[PDB]
Amino acid sequence: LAGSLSSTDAEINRVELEMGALREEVNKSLVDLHDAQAIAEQARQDALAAKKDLDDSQAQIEAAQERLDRQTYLRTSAEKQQAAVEELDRLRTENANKESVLRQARIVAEQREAEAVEKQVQTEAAIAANSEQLNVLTNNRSTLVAQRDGAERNLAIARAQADXXXXXXXXXXXXXXXXXXXTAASIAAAALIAASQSSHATTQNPYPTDEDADPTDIADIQGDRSAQIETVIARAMSQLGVQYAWGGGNANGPTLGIVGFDCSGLTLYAFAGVGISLPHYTGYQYQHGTKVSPSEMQRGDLIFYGPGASQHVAIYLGDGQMIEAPNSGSVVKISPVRWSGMTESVVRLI
């Protein structure tokens, strides 16, 4: 029984890491989508600039055309005509240059707008697939934990034998996280970062579709020290007890699912306190900072799981314990560091 207990906990952690891998897979291609969206919006703001200078060259040529519109007096009027003619020649070749600028800005915006459309539908369907596989994984996990609690009960027997009001809901949650974040410098730094990057929880493109208007456009996130660590870690500890939400989280706190945090969302929140802007994907976070051998990990390091950090992420808290958001049904919690399934390196950002 002891063996089967420990083996169903091994299987529990397998299935939990698989679930993690799928969730983070979707998180990754969500990041890719929002960055392609920013790419598309930058291309058409370029296209709009092109149409702008084409119109100025246009009306310049039309003003010169409208300018086009005894022997001594004829002489000086011929010279006036030459002045007008040379101005039109200038504006002419200017308009040809601007026309080519528009041609190429429009084709580039056409291409990379389409590219963002593609990856958008791509990740919605990837969401569908991963939702199905996740629901399977968590059903299996729940039957496994049933088995595990039962087996523990049997082992105990053996040992004995031997011897829209959702608005009000949201306002409440706001009060919650706002005062749980009670430092002010770190939260305002995280907030700056939050306002620097797109929402990594939705897919719908928050940019214009028609080549009209011009918003702000979000940054691009893909491919002493002691004071810094305590601000970040204090931030993570401050969210202890907050419920888990797939895709949830930003620099200011929990967010609506697809109000909580998922593993890579939580780490982003903590490190944003010291102006460290992190992507909402373990695999991309694994590319930041400096890597350290797991045997030399220390307070502040990031612990990753799965091949190339594809499955899970946690923050090392020091003294052999770490803070993490592990799986559905579990709140943000502190747990001793787990060594099984760990990636080949830890990441030290501070």
Side-chain angles (χ1 to χ4, degrees):
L1 279 147
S4 82
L5 171 76
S6 39
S7 201
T8 62
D9 272 311
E11 189 84 55
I12 270 175
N13 194 341
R14 272 312 297 171
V15 152
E16 273 187 25
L17 288 173
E18 288 183 61
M19 163 182 173
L22 312 178
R23 297 172 110 84
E24 215 63 61
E25 192 180 323
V26 161
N27 260 298
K28 159 255 208 296
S29 78
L30 262 173
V31 160
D32 299 342
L33 171 58
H34 301 319
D35 279 334
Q37 288 177 338
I39 272 178
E41 177 62 28
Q42 168 63 32
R44 181 177 65 83
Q45 310 200 216
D46 278 354
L48 192 142
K51 256 189 291 195
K52 176 58 196 165
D53 79 346
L54 185 90
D55 285 343
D56 177 71
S57 176
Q58 185 72 256
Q60 260 271 349
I61 282 163
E62 279 149 296
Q65 213 273 315
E66 182 167 30
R67 204 205 322 257
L68 256 191
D69 274 2
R70 170 254 177 199
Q71 290 172 26
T72 315
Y73 317 122
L74 306 172
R75 233 166 293 187
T76 69
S77 67
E79 292 136 42
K80 191 153 198 161
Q81 196 238 11
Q82 258 47 246
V85 159
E86 297 136 40
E87 294 320 301
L88 268 168
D89 305 352
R90 160 188 102 187
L91 318 196
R92 176 187 273 104
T93 49
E94 281 269 72
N95 194 281
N97 282 261
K98 292 186 177 180
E99 175 67 56
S100 70
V101 159
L102 252 181
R103 297 162 192 169
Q104 291 155 32
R106 290 166 147 187
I107 56 183
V108 303
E110 286 167 14
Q111 278 181 22
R112 289 203 248 140
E113 204 272 356
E115 284 167 28
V117 170
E118 260 59 61
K119 308 179 89 171
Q120 205 241 43
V121 180
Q122 274 190 36
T123 79
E124 281 148 346
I127 276 175
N130 288 30
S131 177
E132 219 67 84
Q133 294 173 61
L134 278 173
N135 194 301
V136 153
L137 261 307
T138 197
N139 285 136
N140 295 22
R141 187 214 50 78
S142 66
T143 82
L144 280 186
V145 65
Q147 275 178 56
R148 195 258 301 178
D149 292 56
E152 274 150 352
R153 193 196 193 272
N154 295 333
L155 261 187
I157 301 167
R159 304 158 172 125
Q161 255 170 307
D163 282 17
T183 281
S186 73
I187 43 186
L192 189 287
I193 293 177
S196 88
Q197 43 181 78
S198 169
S199 194
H200 279 165
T202 48
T203 50
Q204 317 109 42
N205 184 2
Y207 291 126
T209 294
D210 208 1
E211 316 76 10
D212 297 272
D214 46 284
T216 321
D217 174 13
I218 63 100
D220 157 32
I221 322 163
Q222 74 194 333
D224 64 311
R225 290 186 54 262
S226 171
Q228 294 277 90
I229 288 156
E230 294 305 312
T231 38
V232 172
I233 291 168
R235 264 166 92 80
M237 298 219 233
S238 76
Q239 304 301 305
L240 281 160
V242 166
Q243 68 201 350
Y244 176 105
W246 192 11
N250 67 6
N252 302 323
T255 72
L256 312 101
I258 321 188
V259 283
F261 286 105
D262 66 301
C263 58
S264 53
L266 181 60
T267 59
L268 184 168
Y269 166 71
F271 284 98
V274 298
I276 289 171
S277 175
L278 293 174
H280 203 142
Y281 173 55
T282 59
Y284 293 151
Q285 293 191 119
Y286 194 48
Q287 304 186 325
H288 288 65
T290 302
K291 277 173 184 172
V292 172
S293 177
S295 67
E296 294 57 18
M297 70 170 78
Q298 63 199 30
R299 188 172 173 86
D301 287 57
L302 291 182
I303 298 167
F304 293 84
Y305 297 85
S310 51
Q311 290 173 328
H312 185 52
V313 67
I315 308 177
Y316 185 44
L317 196 142
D319 216 333
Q321 36 174 41
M322 65 192 183
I323 180 164
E324 55 171 310
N327 50 83
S328 176
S330 301
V331 306
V332 176
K333 64 187 212 229
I334 294 182
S335 176
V337 171
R338 178 70 209 189
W339 56 99
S340 197
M342 192 181 317
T343 59
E344 40 177 356
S345 296
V346 299
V347 165
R348 187 161 299 113
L349 293 160
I350 294 160

